[PDB]
Amino acid sequence: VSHEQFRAALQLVVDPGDPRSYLDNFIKIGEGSTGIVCIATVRGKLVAVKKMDLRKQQRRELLFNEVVIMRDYQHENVVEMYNSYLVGDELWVVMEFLEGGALTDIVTHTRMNEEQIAAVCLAVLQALSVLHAQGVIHRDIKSDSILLTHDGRVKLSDFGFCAQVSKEVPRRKSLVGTPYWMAPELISRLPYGPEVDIWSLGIMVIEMVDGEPPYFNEPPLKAMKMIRDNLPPRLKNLHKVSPSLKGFLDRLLVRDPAQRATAAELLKHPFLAKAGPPASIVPLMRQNRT
Ligand SMILES: CCn1cnc2c(Nc3cccc(Cl)c3)nc(N[C@@H]3CCCC[C@H]3N)nc21
Ligand SMILES: [Cl-]
């Protein structure tokens, strides 16, 4: 499929026009897999703009999947998209700005308690149960993909790797994700489904408890071989965690995806009863630390 034809299909979907009319004061706040993210001001609300080069993608079709999903799925725990545009060779998606940043910064700089860990898992499982029911697989669940509001509410972001399964095509086979968070069946190149996100969430629980995913200091291909061949990873800090948290994590990090717990199942797990309110996360954020 041609670039001119791909851009053409995307043009049918995005908002027409040049948003450099509506926006100014662009400040780069980071980089992802698919492009860069800036903050900008509307002509006075401030927004986040993700900018992706149509010609520089390993899997260009995923750009399409991204826009269509956030357009079609609004949930309290999912980052809201306001608009999307084509600007030269770039797809721009305009989204709400979340002042609390990403969970990565919390997990690498602080130790979360179980109330805080439970609140983050509850929020993510709520988003995923709704997405999974409609056949949407996120495929990049990790702390970097979890954003926080000023008052400590959790929002799933970074839908640039998502896919949708259906009755007609109920499994994917593509190798998409981030090595250390990838489910064994996905690493192995087997037909997979929504269950891959449950494993990835398990790995993000490890991040929240231990600060890092398993095998993080290994080359990514070596970590993927270990994920694929070995017993499920265990918490380095095990004696430090409750029986509720261990039993919860034991249901996520199940190698056989057919025996892995679903998002709907896990929403009924007693560990999530520990979830604290959003205000419990606030003191973990960079702006409130010293
Ligand atoms: C859904 C798009 N989006 C809205 N608001 C975002 C966001 N907020 C903040 C808030 C405070 C500091 C920073 Cl660095 C980002 N960060 C943000 N972070 C970057 C985006 C790409 C690189 C990884 C991730 N940390 N993404 C944000
Ligand atoms: Cl249990």
Residue numbers in the entry: 299 to 341, 344 to 590
What text appears in the publication on this structure?
PAKs are serine/threonine protein kinases that are regulated by Rho GTPases of the Cdc42 and Rac families (Knaus et al., 1995; Manser et al., 1994; Martin et al., 1995). Group II PAKs (PAK4–6) regulate a wide variety of cellular functions, and PAK deregulation has been linked to tumor development.
In order to elucidate the molecular mechanisms of inhibition, we determined the structures of a 2, 6, 9-trisubstituted purine inhibitor (N-(cis-2-Aminocyclohexyl)-N-(3-chlorophenyl)-9-ethyl-9H-purine-2, 6-diamine) with PAK4 and PAK5. The 2, 6, 9-trisubstituted purine inhibitor (CGP74514A) has been described as a potent and cell-permeable inhibitor of Cdk1/cyclin B (Giocanti et al., 1999; Wang et al., 2003). To shed light on this conformational plasticity of group II PAKs, we identified small-molecule inhibitors and used them to trap the kinase domains in their closed conformations. The binding orientations of the purine scaffold in PAK4 and PAK5 differed slightly; however, the mode of binding was identical to the one observed in the Src kinase complex (Dalgarno et al., 2006). In PAK4, and in the analogous residues in PAK5, the inhibitor forms two hydrogen bonds with the hinge backbone residue Leu398. In addition, several hydrophobic interactions with the active site residues Phe397, Ile327, Ala348, and Val335 in the N-terminal kinase lobe and Leu398, Leu447, Gly401 and Val379 in the C-terminal kinase lobe are present.
